[PDB]
Amino acid sequence: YIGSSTNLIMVTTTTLMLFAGRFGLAPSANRKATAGLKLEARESGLQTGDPAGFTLADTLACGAVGHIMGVGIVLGLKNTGVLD
């Protein structure tokens, strides 16, 4: 049961969320978005091994949001079988 709908959806959503974080397309730990635009990065003080300052919080928050958006886009499975 690997590589199927659930697998591909979850992995692509979480990987694109993490990339949006690490490349500057997500308002992660050291980036707070205003009313409109996003690129307002400011520091929190959570130096970690990541070269772009990614603590063990944003790398978890982005994952949680990716999994939520995945579950939501997949459990609208009204066109790929209501039971898998």
């Binding site: 049961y1 730990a29 929190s44 919080a57 944003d58 928050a61 039971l83």
Partner: protein, 742 residues
């Protein structure tokens, strides 16, 4: 950032003070030169903000007080569970709950009160109860007195633990300011931590213990040989026998094909004919979804990390054209004055209590609850009363905040400033609306009664005469009855049964719910409710808005929150303090609640409750005369107030006789209140003077110089006695009537 900073051992646990009353107030600690001292002592005990000037100490004090409150609540729960264990017939009640009266209190045979232990069935004698615990204890599958016993023990343990925690946190490790004043993490937790995980763990306890044992009992088994709860989780094969899907461990959940669990988590709706209650599958799905919702909500605000919002970063953005600068700085007001928070929370809590009261009857959650009439009725009216009291308290403390801790120099705001800048317009327009509603909602009753007593029925306000139709309510009911067709396919029936579509649910020859039609009488009663609510709002809002300074007295605030008057000058200035505004509004809130609960009782006993025949003909408890006798006050006397007051008045020499006795004392106090509400003081002062003379003549004049109560305390004792009389009267009436007939 945010840390665990606290302080060590401010105050020592020394009894040095208990022997010196009023240690907190400098004046009180001097000594009781007169008798008003011992009133003023109790009167300002809990008044923490008048004992210091810094918020740290009063915050510590309220932190300890909350523990005291929780200890009392735990002790009460323990007493309840104990009396259920050692003194109830709970097992016999579980045997068959159709026609066995829940009793959980026996009385000692000493002074002839043996009659109190009336016949309740099931080989038991005891004062019948209406608290409604038994439906809960059957929902949670207690089904054994050992469980009640051990639960009472654990509750006692938690009570002592909370009392300890209290003592320790005030005396030994007192929290500091930057802890209290840090609301971000508090919101974060209480959203995610307390409520969410609470509902989640309860969904646990329901899907793993309640659901199977309840389904077994519905199948019909003596609870003696019903398998114990833990023996439903240890050995899987039982639940396997019940639910095929449930024998698949955790694969169907993690692998996102949740539909397998569809059996025990579903979205049926409606009620369950086996017990009239809710399909426990539905309530489990509810609690679980709510848990998930609270957990995902809890992660809003930045606390220590770099993600999340800040409650200061949310308000100041909102600033519209008309109002101007918006909510700037409001964050500081609601973080630097406890009374503000107390008012806000009391208002929201009263509203939630009211909506709980409403949603209870129309959607009976528990099983075999919509057929124990008295329980449903008593629960609803109790919740209504609690909500009303909470709302009035909210208004009072809002006024107190307005007086003391409001100041534009440092606790500034540009929104409340505008609000206060045009108070007169608000109060004027609300007053006019109150007059309009009063006229067009009570004069209608007066006209109807008069045109009745004048032999002109065809000029009345009813369905058979000049007609007023509540069209919007019937519109909404039609929509709710046709919504499960297209809008909400995932449902099975309407959300409840009270919507104007479907069939009726009846268990044990009695009905529980069925459609509810609305007649012109409902229109009139709804407008009466609207009017009375508007008038109470008028009173309390005027008090709050004018607590600072009125166009009558220019510097009212300087005179303080609670003072009797400003002398008889300028034509008399009686009852100008916001405190007196609350004193007034209390009566009107009482009246609103009273008429609401009377309407509820009559409507239920005239259109829903009752018995069902073998063939299926319904004969309601009162005969269905609402839509034809609620439209005349004389009717209210005749059809409802007089008639349905029989069972309380013949109640002497029976089990219910206690309900009879109160029906007089309730009235009596009720009288008594007038003596304080009408008279003044100077008269009583002179009378006390002459009595002091009569005593002093015999060398008995006490050094605790007698003094007639101060004005404010007179009004307070009056209003308390009056509320007590009214509520006790309606209480005795309700209980006697419903538990006798029903």
């Amino acid at each position: 950032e945010v840390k665990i900073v606290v302080d060590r051992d401010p105050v020592k646990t020394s009894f040095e003070e208990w022997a010196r009353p009023g240690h907190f107030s400098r004046t009180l600690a001097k000594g009781p030169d007169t008798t008003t001292w011992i009133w003023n002592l109790h009167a300002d005990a809990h008044d923490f903000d008048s004992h210091t000037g810094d918020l740290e100490e009063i915050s510590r004090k309220v932190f300890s007080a909350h523990f005291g409150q929780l200890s009392i609540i735990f002790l009460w729960l323990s007493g309840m569970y104990f009396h259920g264990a050692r003194f109830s017939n709970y097992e016999a009640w579980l045997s068959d709950p159709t026609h066995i009266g829940p009793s959980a209190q026996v009385v000692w045979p000493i002074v002839g009160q043996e009659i109190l232990n009336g016949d309740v069935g099931g080989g038991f004698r005891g004062i019948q109860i209406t608290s409604g615990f038994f439906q809960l204890w059957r929902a949670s599958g207690i089904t054994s007195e050992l469980q009640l016993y051990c639960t009472a023990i654990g509750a006692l343990v938690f009570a002592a633990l909370m009392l300890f925690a209290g003592w320790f946190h005030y005396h030994k490790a007192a929290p500091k300011l930057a802890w209290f004043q840090d609301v971000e993490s508090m919101l974060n937790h209480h959203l995610a931590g307390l409520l969410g995980l609470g509902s989640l763990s309860w969904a646990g306890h329901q899907i793993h213990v309640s659901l199977p044992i309840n389904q077994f009992l519905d199948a019909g088994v003596d609870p003696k040989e019903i398998p114990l709860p833990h023996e439903f989780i240890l050995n899987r094969d039982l639940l396997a026998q019940l639910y095929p899907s449930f024998a698949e461990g955790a694969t169907p959940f993690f692998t996102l094909n949740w539909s397998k669990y569809a059996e025990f988590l579903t979205f049926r709706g409606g009620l369950d004919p086996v017990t009239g209650g809710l399909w426990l599958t539905d309530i489990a799905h509810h609690h679980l979804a709510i848990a998930i919702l609270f957990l995902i909500a809890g992660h809003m605000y930045r606390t220590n990390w770099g993600i999340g919002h800040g409650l200061k970063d949310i308000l100041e953005a909102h600033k519209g054209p008309f109002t101007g600068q918006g909510h700037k700085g409001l964050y500081e007001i609601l973080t630097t004055s406890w009374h503000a928070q107390l008012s806000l929370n009391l208002a929201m809590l009263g509203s939630t209590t009211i909506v709980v009261a409403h949603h209870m009857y129309s959607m009976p959650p528990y099983p075999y609850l919509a057929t124990d009439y008295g329980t449903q009725l008593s629960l609803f009216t109790h919740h209504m009363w609690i909500g009303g009291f909470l709302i009035v308290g909210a208004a009072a403390h809002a006024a107190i905040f307005m007086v003391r801790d409001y100041d534009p120099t440092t606790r500034y705001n540009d929104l409340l400033d505008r609000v206060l800048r045009h108070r007169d317009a608000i109060i004027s327009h609300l007053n006019w609306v109150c007059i309009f509603l009063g006229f067009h909602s009570f004069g209608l009753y007066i006209h109807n009664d008069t045109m009745s007593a004048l032999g002109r029925p065809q000029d009345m306000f009813s369905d058979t005469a000049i007609q007023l139709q509540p069209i919007f309510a019937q519109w909404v009911q039609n929509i709710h009855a046709t919504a499960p067709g297209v809008t909400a396919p995932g449902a099975t029936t309407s959300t409840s049964l009270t919507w104007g579509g479907g069939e009726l649910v009846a268990v044990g020859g009695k009905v529980a719910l069925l459609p509810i039609p609305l007649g012109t009488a409902d229109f009139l009663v709804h407008h009466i409710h609207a009017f009375t609510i508007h008038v109470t709002v008028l009173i309390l809002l005027k008090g709050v808005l004018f607590a600072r300074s009125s166009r009558l007295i220019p510097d009212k605030a300087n005179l303080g929150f609670r003072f009797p008057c400003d002398g008889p000058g300028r034509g008399g200035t009686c009852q100008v303090s916001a405190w007196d505004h609350v004193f007034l509004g209390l009566f009107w809130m009482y009246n609103a609640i009273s008429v609401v609960i009377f309407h509820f009782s009559w409507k239920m006993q005239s259109d829903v409750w009752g018995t069902i025949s073998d063939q299926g003909v319904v004969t309601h408890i009162t005969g269905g005369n609402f839509a034809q006798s609620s439209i005349t006050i004389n009717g209210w006397l005749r059809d409802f107030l007089w008639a349905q007051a029989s069972q309380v008045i013949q109640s002497y020499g029976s089990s219910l006789s206690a309900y009879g006795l109160f029906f007089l004392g309730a009235h009596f106090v009720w009288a008594f209140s007038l003596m304080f509400l009408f008279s003044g003081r100077g008269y009583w002062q002179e009378l006390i003077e002459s009595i002091v003379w009569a005593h002093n003549k015999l060398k008995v004049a006490p050094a605790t110089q007698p003094r007639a109560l101060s004005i404010i305390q007179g009004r307070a004792v009056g209003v308390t006695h009056y509320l007590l009389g009214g509520i006790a009267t309606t209480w005795a009436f309700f209980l006697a009537r419903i538990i006798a007939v029903g």
